C-alpha cells in the first residue's frame, strides 16, 4: 500500500473537470481547481497547473504529476508545522500515511486543530485517538473515508483498504 493507491481509493480519479461533493470543480485525484461557479476559471486554473492547453481534459500522466505535487505539499505542510511535526515524526510508516491522508484532505491547519487527538496519537494511545477523531465534523461528513483513516491509526495496518 502506497500513498497513490490509498488516495485514489479515497479521492477517486477523474480525467475531466468535475464538481465534487461540495460543488467544487476538481480534476484528478482531489485536485481542487477553483471554488467559483465558473468552468472558465477552472479551465484556466487547470491550464496553469499542467502547463499545456488541455481544455478541461487530462491524462493519467498529468493526473499523476499533479497528485505528486499535491502530496509533497501535504508532506511539506506537516514538516513545517509545529504541531504536526512531532506527531508525524513519532508515528510509524503506516500511521504516518494516515496522517498525510488527513492533511491532503483538510489541509495543514485543519488537522493541526485536532489538538487532543494529535496528542494521544503522540502518546501512542490509539483507541483514545480513534474516539476523538470520530467526534469530529470530518467524520460526520465523509464517514466512510474518516473511518478508513481512523482504522489505519487504530490498527496500524492497511486492513481498511485491502478489501473494499
Structural domain spans, the chain:
1-164
46 is in an annotated binding site: no
Place of cell 508545522: 81
104 is in an annotated binding site: yes
In which region does residue 156 sit, left (phi positive, over 0), alpha (psi from -120 to 50) or beta (all else)? left
90 is in an annotated binding site: no
Burial of 61 (0-12, 13-18, 19+ CB in 10 A): exposed
CA 106 and chain centroid, separation: 7
Contact status, residue 25 vs residue 42, Cβ threshold 8 Å: yes
Task: Give the residue numbers marked as catalytic.
Answer: 11, 20
Return all residues near 158 (Cβ < 8 A) that are at least 6 apart: 1, 94, 152
CA 75 and chain centroid, separation: 10
38 is in an annotated binding site: no
What's the order of all strands across the beta sheet hosting 25-28?
14-19, 25-28, 31-34
Distances (CA, A) of 93 to 102, 109, 152: 15, 22, 11
Q: Is residue 28 helix, strand or coil?
A: strand
Q: Give the resolution value in Å.
A: 2.2
- Which experimental technique did the depositors report for determining this structure? X-ray
* Closest C-alpha to 73, from 53, 103, 112: 103
Q: Which option is the CATH number for 1-164: 1.10.530.40, 1.50.10.10, 3.40.50.410, 3.30.70.890?
A: 1.10.530.40
Separation between Cα atoms, residue 39 and residue 36, nearest integer Å:
8
Cell of 46: 487547470
Q: Helices 143-155 and 93-106, interaxial angle, to 10°?
A: 160
* Closest C-alpha to 148, from 121, 136, 130, 132: 130
Residue 101 host element (H or E): helix 93-106
Distances (CA, A) of 25 to 18, 20, 65: 5, 6, 18
Amino acid at each position: 500500500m502506497n500513498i497513490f493507491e490509498i488516495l485514489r481509493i479515497d479521492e477517486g480519479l477523474r480525467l475531466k473537470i468535475y464538481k465534487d461533493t461540495e460543488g467544487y470543480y476538481t480534476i484528478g485525484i482531489g485536485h481542487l481547481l477553483t471554488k467559483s461557479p465558473s468552468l472558465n476559471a477552472a479551465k484556466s486554473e487547470l491550464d496553469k497547473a499542467i502547463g499545456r492547453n488541455c481544455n478541461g481534459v487530462i491524462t493519467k500522466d498529468e493526473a499523476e504529476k499533479l497528485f505528486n505535487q499535491d502530496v509533497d505539499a501535504a508532506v511539506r505542510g506537516i514538516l513545517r508545522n509545529a504541531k504536526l511535526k512531532p506527531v508525524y515524526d513519532s508515528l510509524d510508516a503506516v500511521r504516518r500515511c494516515a496522517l498525510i491522508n488527513m492533511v491532503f484532505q483538510m489541509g495543514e491547519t485543519g488537522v493541526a486543530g485536532f489538538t487532543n487527538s494529535l496528542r494521544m496519537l503522540q502518546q501512542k494511545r490509539w483507541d483514545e485517538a480513534a474516539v476523538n477523531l470520530a467526534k469530529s465534523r470530518w467524520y460526520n461528513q465523509t464517514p466512510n473515508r474518516a473511518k478508513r483513516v481512523i482504522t489505519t491509526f487504530r490498527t496500524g495496518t492497511w486492513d481498511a483498504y485491502k478489501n473494499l
